[PDB]
Ligand binder design. Sequence first.
Ligand code: CDL
Ligand code: PLC
Ligand code: DGT
Ligand code: MG
Ligand code: ZN
Lengths: 98, 347, 99, 459, 39, 320
Amino acid sequence: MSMVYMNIMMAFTVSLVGLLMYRSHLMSSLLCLEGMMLSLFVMAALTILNSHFTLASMMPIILLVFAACEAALGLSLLVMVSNTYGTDYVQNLNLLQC
Amino acid sequence: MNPIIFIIILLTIMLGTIIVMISSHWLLVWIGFEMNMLAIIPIMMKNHNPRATEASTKYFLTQSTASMLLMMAVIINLMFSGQWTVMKLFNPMASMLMTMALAMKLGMAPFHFWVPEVTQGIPLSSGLILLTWQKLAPMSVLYQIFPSINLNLILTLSVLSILIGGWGGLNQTQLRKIMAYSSIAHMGWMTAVLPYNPTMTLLNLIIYIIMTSTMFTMFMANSTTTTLSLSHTWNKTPIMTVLILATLLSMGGLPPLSGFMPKWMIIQEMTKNNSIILPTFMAITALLNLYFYMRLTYSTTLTMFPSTNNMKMKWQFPLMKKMTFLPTMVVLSTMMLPLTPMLSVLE
Amino acid sequence: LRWQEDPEPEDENLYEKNPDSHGYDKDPAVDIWNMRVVFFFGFSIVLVLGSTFVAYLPDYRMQEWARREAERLVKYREAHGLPIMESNCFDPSKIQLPE
Amino acid sequence: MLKYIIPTIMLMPLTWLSKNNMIWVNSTAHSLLISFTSLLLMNQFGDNSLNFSLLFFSDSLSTPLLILTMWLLPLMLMASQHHLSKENLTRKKLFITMLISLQLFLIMTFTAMELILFYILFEATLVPTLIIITRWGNQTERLNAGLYFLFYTLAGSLPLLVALIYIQNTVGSLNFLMLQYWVQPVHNSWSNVFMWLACMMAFMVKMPLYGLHLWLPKAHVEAPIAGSMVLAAVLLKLGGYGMLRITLILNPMTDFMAYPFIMLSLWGMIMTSSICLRQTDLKSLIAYSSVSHMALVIVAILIQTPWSYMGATALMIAHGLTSSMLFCLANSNYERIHSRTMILARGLQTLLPLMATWWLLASLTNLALPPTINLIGELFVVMSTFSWSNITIILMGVNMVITALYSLYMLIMTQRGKYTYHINNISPSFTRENALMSLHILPLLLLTLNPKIILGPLY
Amino acid sequence: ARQWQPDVEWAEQYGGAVMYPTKETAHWKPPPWNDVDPP
Amino acid sequence: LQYGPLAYILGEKATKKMTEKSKLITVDGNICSGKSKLAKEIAEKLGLKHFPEAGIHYVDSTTGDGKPLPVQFSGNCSLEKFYDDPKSNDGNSYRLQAWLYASRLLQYADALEHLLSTGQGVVLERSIYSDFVFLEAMYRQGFIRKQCVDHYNQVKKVTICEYLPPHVVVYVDVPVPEVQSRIQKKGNPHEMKITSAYLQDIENAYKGTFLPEMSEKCEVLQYSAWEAQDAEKVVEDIEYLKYDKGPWLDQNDRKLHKLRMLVQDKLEVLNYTSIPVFLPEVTVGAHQSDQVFQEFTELPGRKYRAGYNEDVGDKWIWLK
Ligand SMILES: CCCCCCCCCCCCCCCCCC(=O)OC[C@H](COP(=O)([O-])OCC(O)COP(=O)([O-])OC[C@@H](COC(=O)CCCCCCCCCCCCCCCCC)OC(=O)CCCCCCCCCCCCCCCCC)OC(=O)CCCCCCCCCCCCCCCCC
Ligand SMILES: CCCCCCCCCCCC(=O)OC[C@H](COP(=O)(O)OCC[N+](C)(C)C)OC(=O)CCCCCCCCCCC
Ligand SMILES: Nc1nc2c(ncn2[C@H]2C[C@H](O)[C@@H](COP(=O)(O)OP(=O)(O)OP(=O)(O)O)O2)c(=O)[nH]1
Ligand SMILES: [Mg+2]
Ligand SMILES: [Zn+2]
């Protein structure tokens, strides 16, 4: 591939592992989710710019617009979780076991 | 919720799924999924209670993670082939993430732990959308990229789904959880025949949607969500118990009902490819599904459970629920075996 | 008692209210007509006519014909010197044995 | 076979559109008429079977089982009138619907030319049978009996479906006429050993084979009277009929694969007869008696001789009439004392002199008294197995002794002796009950005069 | 006799959180009748 | 045009038909407190629809031809037998109270449907918010067991949460000794056995819990027996109420659309009044319930859906 791709590709892996291992806060994981889209944004832009894929120069912007809209929907749920149990801890969200 | 906003949100759930099915570009496929997840959360939060809030959160995190993996597969596929077309992927690593992203969205084992819990925390009408409509979009993509899916991966996810759906359903009394595990079990059949004959993936999907929609509709009519509450139906609407018996027997694959057709055709398309061990193991493990279906038939229609005194006040009012297409769905769920050769319309 | 429930009823003897009862039904009018259809279609038609029908079946399984045919071949093959029954079912002129 | 299928369907509109007090009369009369027309199937030729169309055909093996099937529905309707008296009108007409839909599947099962159409209708009989047991049985154990009856059959049926589809892909067809001319011998290989097991274990669970029979003493005991009659008169013969058909495409592997199943049947034939000597339940005693007779049919089918098949066909018809008769007898006592213990009501010959005459004739046929067709079928199987191995006369002679011991012990326990003092409600025998026994025994004895119509295709 | 139908003891076997009680599954109260929990 | 989402979009909002005189008023008090007269007079003065107190046979008054049905189709519970034998072993004590709550719950829905669909206020007697006073009275005298109280609260807490509380609560107060005197004067052979403690427990329930908890969300007017006779004074007070509290100030067209969709479908209202809690007082066996269901289906004009019974002179069945 190339030398830069290794770190971008390894940055996605770090964020994925970070998202799959919650500690206590729900806000912490949403950041790991928005880190993933940042790595995908940079990785796609590197590919498109280097190959002179002109019409694909708009794709990274579309990736950013939808990923931010999804992030907004994520924060709204976090707020409604905090207004119920007083904190954004994931251990509280355990009613559905039974 | 305002009625007009309810229609608008529903049409956006449909539009998201339609965009996936009419798109020749991976970006529009991804946009289709995003528009679909954005619109379905409000119908899960509509009852405004902690359980709904928890269910919507567990669904968002699962579907958000799945969409990120899918977009990672698309970019890897762009690097190694320089195109966006919705077809076979050109990198084995892209195929694995793509296959795993779709598995998470579908709810296949071992990416299954959210289906019982999300379906339990939302109303019956929201569960009907979740278990029937939300399965169309991922299956459309699998129909198109199956030539490059890793055989050992797709067949391994199929086998686990059949097992975990079977064992999970035995230990349930809540109706919403029983359908959730029933949904996991039937997914394994659809993806087991996919490498061999994708036409039978659609047939099993169509039949599953018809049968599943019939069950949820009958539960919604009597507002029943637990096994016991369903056992009072014989004393309120006797006809509805005979329809539940017939559909439950159909879902179990017992001939001569409709639910035997997909299990019949999938076993045919696998023995043609010299696959004998897998269809037998799949068919035998499906008896677990027939068991906890039969248990509901014993407490609903074949025995008369205890009733309560206040039930007598219900006899004086009719059913004002919509029960849309219930007469048509129930007949299609039971009396379609003589029309099996009609599956060619799906080719 | 754990619940409200009706006591178990008592079995009703059909002889108490109808000593002529045939046992089919409580209503005497139905009880007598039930007996005639059972006894007419059952015995008069199925067993009697069916027994006669089976008795006069037209040569069931061609058994009588085979005996009559066998007597013919015996007459022919016996008054010509030919063996009564050859040991080969098919003529060897058509069989091509390996090597 | 449309001339019989359509009339059977029309019984369903007849039951639901009839007067509320004439459901038992219209149903009984018209089903008897359907039975009378079934005699037209005896147009059997010596060389070619009777081929109606691309879906249905009849030969000498199908005809006796079809005529028996359509002769059993009227008898089931008579036997169900008593205990379905306080039942409400709608549920009574659902009960009759199950019986009719059961006869509809049976007649199409026994005449299906293609072997996958046989599978669908063969499996379709479970649904109506399961509903009768679990919805109209009396005891709390009918629910668990239904589960045992369901999952035992499907555990064997599902492998059978795979085997049949595999045969069509290889052979190219499943038409039974075609298989008679395109059948190829089965090579000895590990794959072919499991093809043999799949094709047979489905039918061994329904005969039933000794070892796989624990559902029979539960289904035949907890079912209503009509359930026991059809269960032990026709439904057991689906497996025997299935074996006689599918053994065409298993030669020569049946030479050595039959050994494990011949020893289970021959020794199981003595375990089941012995169990009858100590059963404390009159209805469960008759159930185990069915396993012993059907063990003879398994041996007869697996050795594949002209005499064995003629004996096997005769035994199946003889057992169906004799076993269904015994259940009716045990039911008449139950409808009076409402209990199944055999040692509860004794000396009944003093109070019901005629009903004890039916008991005597039923037991004589059960223990194969000549010249009954019970004896003709059993004798031919004994003759055939002697050629197979002369030592088998030892086992088939010991079972004869035990068979007469439990047949007459049941007769002596309930008919002879001294009557129970505190049981005082033994009312005389209704004409309905006496006619029910006369419709079982008279055809059974008449067949002795012209027994060639129940000897099957190899006569 | 009369056809047996389930009584309260039989029906309570299906009114628990799970069909097969174990050590872990003890204390699992059945969900609220209307999916609403206290605030 | 049956009310539904389509009609609401077409214009059938609730605020378009509700005014400042569209109020729900509940008159509460002890036994023989004259609330029947006071409530019936507030209705005519304000032009409100009056709902007679929901009894054992209220549901029958709304369905069918309107006449009461035999007592075997209403649980076999009798109010007369409660006074004579409050300690009966057949459970008629609590079985009566559980059925009464369902009738009150059924009526409180009819009250809201009339108000929300026509804009006309209604006056009720002992709504579901006050039915717990009798429960406390029975429990403290040993009439019903503690399990029955638990069952009552479980059903109440999943039903009462779906409805708005009354705008105005009018409480007629009578000292316990005087009430017991009026019972004797009336002369009911059965009601005369009401002991002093039973009437005192109701008073404590009203004073201790009902009124204090019912004033944080309603305009509560309290009157004595003497004052209650002046209707125009009570009606004058109801017309000068501020209405500055309660959850009615947070309602809009969207929120009231959902409520009307609920109180018009009566099987959804009565849904949780039959929860599968196997309690001997309110449980029925399979053989008994099946038999009663068949008889209920043989009554005139009740074998089919209202409008399709040929025996009550319905027509055009083959086109409806
Ligand atoms: C069998 C294998 C399949 C398994 C099926 C499993 C279900 C079996 C049901 C029986 C066992 C259930 C357990 C019994 C205990 C629970 C019963 C109970 O307590 O409540 C009684 C229950 C409650 O009624 P109720 O409120 O208490 O009082 C009734 C009133 O007095 C109202 O009374 P009404 O005076 O106003 O009239 C009543 C009305 C009844 O109202 C209806 O609901 C009619 C619905 C009919 C649609 C389904 C017909 C499909 C079968 C075709 C039948 C016609 C045959 C062709 C003859 C015409 C030739 C063109 O009857 C009629 O007017 C004419 C109907 C004639 C048909 C008889 C209906 C029963 C058929 C189902 C039995 C199985 C048939 C298998 C046939 C397959 C072999 C060919 O009674 C019923 O209404 C239930 C009967 C209707 C059930 C419909 C089930 C449809 C789904 C079955 C699909 C079959 C698939 C077969 C494979 C097809 C392959 C091509
Ligand atoms: C062709 C493939 C199959 C399609 C299946 C048929 C369609 C689905 C079923 C019918 C749905 C239905 O009618 O929804 C339920 C209700 C019907 O009003 P109701 O009060 O419930 O009944 C009324 C009739 N009655 C009581 C007499 C029986 O409709 C509605 O709320 C209609 C809302 C329309 C407003 C549109 C807003 C703008 C949307 C566009 C924004 C860009
Ligand atoms: N167990 C029980 N009895 C009740 C309940 N409400 C009323 N009752 C009884 C008490 C009375 O004996 C009878 C009617 O009570 P009322 O409240 O109507 O008082 P009364 O009729 O004597 O005069 P009034 O209506 O106030 O003018 O029914 C209740 O919620 N539970
Ligand atoms: Mg009063
Ligand atoms: Zn009896």
